Amino acid sequence: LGGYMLGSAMSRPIIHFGSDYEDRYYRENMHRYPNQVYYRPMDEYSNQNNFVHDCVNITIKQHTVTTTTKGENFTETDVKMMERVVEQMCITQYERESQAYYQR
To answer: Which regions span the lipid bilayer?
Structure first.
């Protein structure tokens, strides 16, 4: 875990799934959901979506695994839902730290 880092927090984003009900679905669960996302220090990774991709996957993982071991089976849809919301969160947390690189 401590080879990764958690950074700052934010409020939950808002992301349309193509179903006008699937969008509401996660809304009607959003009391919890992820609210912080896991990365590594800026070093070589430079991409847009591709920085986000692992950032998302590892956050999504840590937010699934423990929940699974509490008896809550997030389906494929529950997990894919989180991946979008974590994408926006990981852009935000990515960029927050790009600004701090420029600030040197």
So the answer is: none
Cα(102)–Cα(85) distance, integer angstroms: 26
By C-alpha distance, which of 98, 96, 90 is closest to 34? 90
Which CATH number do you get for residue 96? 1.10.790.10
Backbone phi, psi, residue 89, to 5°: -60, -45
Q: Given phi > 0 = left and psi -120 to 50 = alpha, else beta, which region is 73? A: beta
Determine the structural domain holding residue 42 and report its residue range: 1-104
For residue 5, list its beta bridge partners.
39
CB 92 within 8 A of CB 10: yes
